[PDB]
Amino acid sequence: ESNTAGDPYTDYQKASGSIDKAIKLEARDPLVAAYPVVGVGMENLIISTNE
Amino acid sequence: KKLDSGKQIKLETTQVSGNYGTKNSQGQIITEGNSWSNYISQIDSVSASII
Amino acid sequence: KKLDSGKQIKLETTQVSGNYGTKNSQGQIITEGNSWSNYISQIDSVSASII
Amino acid sequence: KKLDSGKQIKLETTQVSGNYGTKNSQGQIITEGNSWSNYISQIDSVSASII
Amino acid sequence: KKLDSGKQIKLETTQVSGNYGTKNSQGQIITEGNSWSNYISQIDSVSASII
Amino acid sequence: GETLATIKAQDNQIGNNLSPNETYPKKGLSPLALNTMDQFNARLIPINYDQLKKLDSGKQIKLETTQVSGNYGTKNSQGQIITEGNSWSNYISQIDSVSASII
Amino acid sequence: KKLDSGKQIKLETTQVSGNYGTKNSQGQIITEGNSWSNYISQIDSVSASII
Amino acid sequence: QWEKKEAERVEKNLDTLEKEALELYKKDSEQISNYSQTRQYFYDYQIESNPREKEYKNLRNAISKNKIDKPINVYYFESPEKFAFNKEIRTENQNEISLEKFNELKETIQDKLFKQDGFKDVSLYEPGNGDEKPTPLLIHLKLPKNTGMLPYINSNDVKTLIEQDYSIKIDKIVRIVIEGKQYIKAEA
Numbered sequence A: 001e002s003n004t005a006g007d008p009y010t011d012y013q014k015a016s017g018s019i020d021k022a023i024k025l026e027a028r029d030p031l032v033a034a035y036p037v038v039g040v041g042m043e044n045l046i047i048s049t050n051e
Numbered sequence B, C, D, E, G: 001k002k003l004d005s006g007k008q009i010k011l012e013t014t015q016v017s018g019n020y021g022t023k024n025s026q027g028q029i030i031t032e033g034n035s036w037s038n039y040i041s042q043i044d045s046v047s048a049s050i051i
Numbered sequence F: 001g002e003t004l005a006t007i008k009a010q011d012n013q014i015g016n017n018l019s020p021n022e023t024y025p026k027k028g029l030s031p032l033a034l035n036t037m038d039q040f041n042a043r044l045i046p047i048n049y050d051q052l053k054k055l056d057s058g059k060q061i062k063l064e065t066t067q068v069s070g071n072y073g074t075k076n077s078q079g080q081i082i083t084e085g086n087s088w089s090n091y092i093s094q095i096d097s098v099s100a101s102i103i
Numbered sequence H: 001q002w003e004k005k006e007a008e009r010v011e012k013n014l015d016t017l018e019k020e021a022l023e024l025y026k027k028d029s030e031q032i033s034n035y036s037q038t039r040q041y042f043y044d045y046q047i048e049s050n051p052r053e054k055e056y057k058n059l060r061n062a063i064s065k066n067k068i069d070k071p072i073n074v075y076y077f078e079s080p081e082k083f084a085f086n087k088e089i090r091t092e093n094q095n096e097i098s099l100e101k102f103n104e105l106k107e108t109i110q111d112k113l114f115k116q117d118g119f120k121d122v123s124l125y126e127p128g129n130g131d132e133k134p135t136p137l138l139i140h141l142k143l144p145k146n147t148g149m150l151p152y153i154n155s156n157d158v159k160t161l162i163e164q165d166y167s168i169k170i171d172k173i174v175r176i177v178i179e180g181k182q183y184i185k186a187e188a
């Protein structure tokens, strides 16, 4: 496999570091995948009664 | 007025549209010009349905 | 007012537009620049109809 | 008010736009960017018109 | 209220845009990227006017 | 303590150039108008009745900038300068990672 | 109400966008991708302004 | 439209070293072309030691990775001394071709079998206005079933990179007028 971890970057790019410099160094191991886990949290809710 | 009675609304899916992925020799996956509609009719003509 | 009587609305199709598929060396099918309207008149002009 | 009388509405075609078909690099017919308006003035300019 | 008097609406043309025709890599005439506005300023600044 | 609206600047509010140590509009001009909220600049920014009654007191509306989009300049095959497909957010994260900030 | 008085509406130009002409592979003048905003700052940063 | 789409699409399903050979083709077109023309005339150690062999065969496999399904008509310019005509048809700042040079060329390019070699870029349409035309001789070739063609882009246009393991057979030459110059269209 050229992409062992299944992510857009190959094993050489991840091992050497020729990727986004904002990527955690954890993901520079060809077994750990570069992967964002994004979630939304609501803080408060406003209601506008259009009488 | 008909719905304010024992009448219910059913839902029938008539078709589904979606993409498939195509890898290069690296892990570059594209899912844009790739439609399953191009192949639904061809697969349903050379096959036998098993469920 | 006509409609709230014996009068009925008829539906007749004047034309139909749609695509054909063209493969490649592999089984990559494309149905986007392929328009049947480019060939409808040419087919009608060199043929005999049999129903 | 003028129309609730002997007055009628006429209809005059000031121009008509459309396409012509050519064969692209392969045996496929294309009619997309081939506009007839590019050739109307030029055809009228070098011709005699017989009806 | 001005208009329901001797006052009239005049029409003045500030500019006109349009295309010209050139032969493309085929025998076909193309008038899409061709714009007379690209040459209106250049012709006026190299010539003399005659009416 | 509540966000009325989050507005992205559309065509009427985009600044074509912004050099360092400068503003848009320039030093001698009057500020922009952030009037609308939709994409085509045809829908104004509404508040409801409670927020309007809150404004008819000492309460003030604050403005925070959460991000800015913009381009940089690059020379193409010819000697032209292309600033169209050149986004700064492609590097905003990478620069913040390999750097120390000094103000 | 402020305008139904001695007060006037002033107008200020904050920026102007536009194109410049460039002769492409053939003798055609192109002004589409060419924007003066790409050079406004560069010109203002290497120059003295004489009026 | 069609060629732009298919070309920009082939430039993704290429292997990284294949795109390496294709992009270092846009740098050493003449050099790697001549080396593809004359690579096979060495010793074996003189072959697998040559640093161009990597890109050479990578580019060759990239080409042969997409073979056509039906015959195609291609167009490309050629120099006269490619066909043993060691004189000039006319200098490219002249506009006319003399009947004498026409007869000489016809006499010398009618009865041979010119083997070809290496890579070359071709087009799918005759030259127009804006295209570069340095030589008076225009070869109209017919590429047959299953011949590798690779469409690539020099950032504005499309070229068809092919490899030549055939031998061209001239059928008829005619003198053509293009833009007020006189070229030669030879059917091969």
Ligand SMILES: [Ca+2]
Pocket (backbone or CB within 6 Å): A001, A002, A003, A004, A011
């Ligand atoms: Ca691997």
